[PDB]
């Protein structure tokens, strides 16, 4: 009942083309990357504070020295990605800002689709394609998918509308 | 292409303006140690 809400959006609002949703993704997707690159950096930078291999115990839940080496980490990344952290306090704030911010932009976006104030088309592209029938971009391609999603879906998805689309109306490619 | 005529400005300002705000602060910071 949600996957439906997804496609409906793609089909009527053309969400994926909205700059706000894009940020939404860039955040959720990059917040995952932080939540996984950090986790791995910590675990593979641990000092030895135990004798066995299962180094989970080596960590005294009680205070004292850092358990991994921020200094070593900062060195790794900086030579293997040019940039690297070096301020645990900033690292952990970034980790709060990234995923949080993106879901906020994600929201503003939808507040917009409430008024169907979507980011459906690029006029410059439409005007061109209306006049020149040989102009095709992945943009236009996707727009036809939407026409399809609405034509075939609408009927059973909006019953109170009593839609009736005769087979001859249904937009379709060739063969299929 | 029939693009928005104010696009070239909406993009130019959207870059320069806040971007300059940051350049000002940074440099004014450096100079609190005579730098620049």
């Amino acid at each position: 009942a949600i996957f439906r809400f997804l496609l409906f959006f793609q089909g009527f609002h053309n969400w994926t083309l909205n700059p706000f949703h894009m940020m939404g993704v860039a955040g959720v997707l990059g917040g995952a990357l932080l939540c996984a690159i950090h986790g791995a950096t910590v675990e593979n930078t641990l000092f030895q504070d135990g004798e066995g291999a299962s180094t989970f115990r080596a960590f005294n839940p009680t205070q004292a020295e850092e358990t991994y080496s921020m200094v070593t980490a900062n060195r790794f990344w900086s030579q293997i990605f040019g940039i690297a952290f070096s301020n645990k306090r900033w690292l952990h704030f970034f980790m709060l800002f990234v995923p949080v911010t993106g879901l906020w932009m994600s929201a503003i976006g939808v507040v917009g689709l409430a008024l169907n104030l979507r980011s459906y088309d690029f006029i410059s592209q439409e005007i061109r394609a209306a006049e020149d029938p040989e102009f095709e971009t992945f943009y236009t391609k996707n727009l036809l998918l939407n026409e399809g999603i609405r034509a075939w879906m609408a009927p059973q998805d909006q019953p109170h509308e009593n839609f009736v689309f005769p087979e001859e109306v249904l937009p379709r490619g060739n063969a299929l | 292409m029939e693009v928005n005529q104010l696009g070239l400005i909406a993009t130019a300002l959207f870059v320069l303006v806040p971007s300059v705000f940051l350049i000002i602060l940074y440099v004014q910071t450096e100079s609190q140690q005579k730098s620049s």
Partner: peptide
């Protein structure tokens, strides 16, 4: 005119990459 505007902001991200790497404030041990 757009092409140019897109290629510029891009050329800027790329020069900003150089500086952020090879012109940062070295993380000195304190």
């Amino acid at each position: 005119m757009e092409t140019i505007t897109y290629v510029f902001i891009f050329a800027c991200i790329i020069a900003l990459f150089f500086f952020a790497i090879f012109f940062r404030e070295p993380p000195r041990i304190t």
